A and B are shown apart, each in its own frame.
Chain A
Amino acid sequence: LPAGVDALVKDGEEVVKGQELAPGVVSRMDGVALYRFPRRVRVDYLRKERAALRIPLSAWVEKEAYRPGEVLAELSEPYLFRAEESGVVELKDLAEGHLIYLRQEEEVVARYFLPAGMTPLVVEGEIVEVGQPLAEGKGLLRLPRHMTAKEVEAEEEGDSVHLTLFLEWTEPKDYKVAPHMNVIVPEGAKVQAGEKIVAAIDPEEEVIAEAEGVVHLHEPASILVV
């Protein structure tokens, strides 16, 4: 198969006669196909944060486990997300949503989460203070589909309820292999933080995981079933 062509079926998977393995690839037999010299490997890293979220209870959906797409609260009327800390902000765009890093001087004084559709009212690294409308929801605002919220934290002052969260998401990145390279780790495998992925000529071209991730093989030079 020519460059750019990706194999639909995953590595080490049963393939029926005639079944497509790619746009122009048509299997001629029943067996298990294997990737040969994958020309690209996409690794999605895992990133965790304990964010603080503040939303009025009147509209809040009370849920311990928020999965991707799980609808986060309601927000009857558009609600300003009020700052509980003064310092230097920051904006981490999380897919549909965002994240605020509030830091006095260097270290952070707190961690903040913005659900999908809850928009940032402050520039990254901008001068801000407490009691300040950091974000705003227009209502609705479900959890992002690339991120899971484990381990909810329940606390309430009355009207606007403050819940801390345990956030686990992913940040995918691609690595295009070269002829001087060869895949080491197998397809679909849990990968240690900071480990060799694809062995190369010089140790430089060698792929070294930036964080605890997962490995995925894509668009190999060729594939064959046996």
Chain B
Amino acid sequence: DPVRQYLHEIGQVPLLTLEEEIDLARKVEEGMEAIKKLSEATGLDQELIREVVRAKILGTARIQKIPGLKEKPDPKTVEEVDGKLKSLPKELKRYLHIAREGEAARQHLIEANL
């Protein structure tokens, strides 16, 4: 049953009070600015690596594999961006995790307000 479905799916995950809320928003903005920070690392647009985060986050093979017959394929226009910034010192490789956790926290806060 589709009606009860969504209601029982969102009723699974709780809400967010001021603590969690403010925190989450802060996480998201930190990930964003982290992306802008790494946008000068290899010279990649803030939106580019941003979606490059999705490749390993909200699905592995399912985000770019079928947005039509053509999009940004995993081996070609993705992989060379995943293993590019992959060799950078601490002061860079940290913003990666900042963006990972920010990107996740985004979806999180969304689910919370669903």
Residues of A within 8 A of B22 (CB): 179-180
Contacts of A179 in B (CB 8 A): 18-19, 22
A180 cross-chain contacts in B, Cβ below 8 A:
22
A-B contact pairs, 11 of them (CB 8 A): A37-B19, A37-B20, A37-B23, A179-B18, A179-B19, A179-B22, A180-B22, A182-B23, A182-B26, A199-B26, A221-B19
A182 and B20 CA atoms in complex are apart in Å by 10
Q: How does the 8 Å CB contact mask read for B59-78 relative to A, with 1 for contact and 0 for none?
A: 00000000000000000000
CB distance from A146 to the nearest CB of B (A): 34
B-contacting residues of A (Cβ < 8 Å)?
37, 179-180, 182, 199, 221
Q: Closest A-chain residue to B20, C-beta based?
A: A37
Q: Using CB atoms, name the residue of chain B closest to A177.
A: B19
Q: How far is the CA of A179 from the CA of B26 in the complex (A)?
A: 12
How many of chain B's residues have a CB under 8 angstroms from any CB in A? 6
Closest Cβ of chain B: how far from A2's Cβ, in Å?
Answer: 14
CB distance from A106 to the nearest CB of B (A): 44
- For A37, the chain B residues whose CB sits under 8 A away are 19-20, 23
A10 → chain B, closest Cβ, in Å?
Answer: 22
CA–CA, A179 to B20, complex, Å? 9
The CA of A221 and the CA of B23, in the complex, are separated in Å by 13
Of the listed residues B19, B22, B23, the one surrounded by the most CB atoms of chain A closer than 10 A to its CB is B19
In the complex, the 4 A-B pairs of residues with the closest C-beta atoms, listed nearest first: A179-B18, A179-B19, A37-B19, A182-B23
Interface 1/0 per residue, B17-29 and A, CB below 8 Å: 0111011001000
Which residue of chain B has its CB nearest to the CB of A179? B18
CB-nearest residue of chain A to B17: A179
In B13-68, which residues have CB < 8 Å from any A CB?
18-20, 22-23, 26
Nearest-neighbor residue (CB-CB) of A182 within chain B: B23
Complex Cα spacing A37 to B18, Å: 12
Chain A residues positioned under 8 Å from B26 (CB to CB): 182, 199
Please indicate the chain A residues that have their CB under 8 angstroms from the CB of B19 in the complex.
37, 179, 221
Bound complex: CA A221 to CA B16 (Å): 14
Q: Which residues of A contact B20 (CB under 8 A)?
A: 37
**Bound: A179/B24 CA distance, A:** 12
Q: Which residues of A contact B23 (CB under 8 A)?
A: 37, 182
A37 to B22, CA, bound (A): 11
- CA gap between A220 and B36 in the complex, in Å: 33
